[PDB]
Amino acid sequence: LKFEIIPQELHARLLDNRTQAVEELKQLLGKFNPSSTPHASLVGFISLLYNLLDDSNFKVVHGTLQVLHLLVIRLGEQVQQFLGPVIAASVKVLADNKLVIKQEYMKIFLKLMKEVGPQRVLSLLLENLKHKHSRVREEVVNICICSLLTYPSEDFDLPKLSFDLAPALVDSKRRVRQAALEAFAVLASSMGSGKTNVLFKAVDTVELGVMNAVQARLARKTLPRLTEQGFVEYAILMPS
């Protein structure tokens, strides 16, 4: 058993129709206890999954993401030990503009937030606002929105959050900016109106136009919402 989990024949089929192999792997994961598995082996396994997400075939990527989700599930608290790797793995597939993919990585990120708390997840994740793929940036912002709609205000450091998100307000790409304005509407709602002042300071750190769009958005007292699938639906397309 490779990594104490995978039969060498399945491993060989995974590394050399990868999709069937991947689903076989999922089956094996079904009844598996990583609390009985040495750390080094779990590191190996996760490394393998990370490589499988490099596949050109999105169905392999999808199946691997399902395996990763299940692993995260089985792990429980132990996920805390692998927060970094699992988040790098999940950020990789954010460039992939496919709904089946997004289903799986949204499942993963929500599980992560459930296990180690939303703020941790989001700070790690928000470092990827400097990522060169604009869909990565866009989805970072949407996962933040999802987080702020799933968890109460006090689970978050909202000033920190708005300062970390303010650069998306001036992103070169329209979709990232639209995402960031929705996020700012949710921040305004979560701070309560007696503290929007900090949001305007956040806007000051990236512009000193954006002010006008932010105010226009905030004046619209409507918020995005979450689908059952955990996707964000936007409240409004600002003419901007």
From Swiss-Prot:
Involved in ciliogenesis. It is required for appropriate acetylation and polyglutamylation of ciliary microtubules, and regulation of cilium length. Interacts with microtubules and promotes microtubule polymerization via its HEAT repeat domains, especially those in TOG region 2 and 4. It is found in: Cell projection, Cilium; Cytoplasm, Cytoskeleton; Cytoplasm, Cytoskeleton, Cilium axoneme. The chain holds residues 345 to 594 of 1776 of the full protein. HEAT repeats lie at residues 1-34, 40-77, 81-116, 117-154, 156-193. Residues 7-240 are annotated as: TOG 2. It comes from the Eukaryota. The TOG regions are composed of HEAT-type repeats that assemble into a solenoid structure. They mediate interaction with microtubules. This is TOG array regulator of axonemal microtubules protein 1. Interacts with ARMC9. Interacts with CCDC66, CEP104 and CSPP1. Belongs to the Crescerin family.
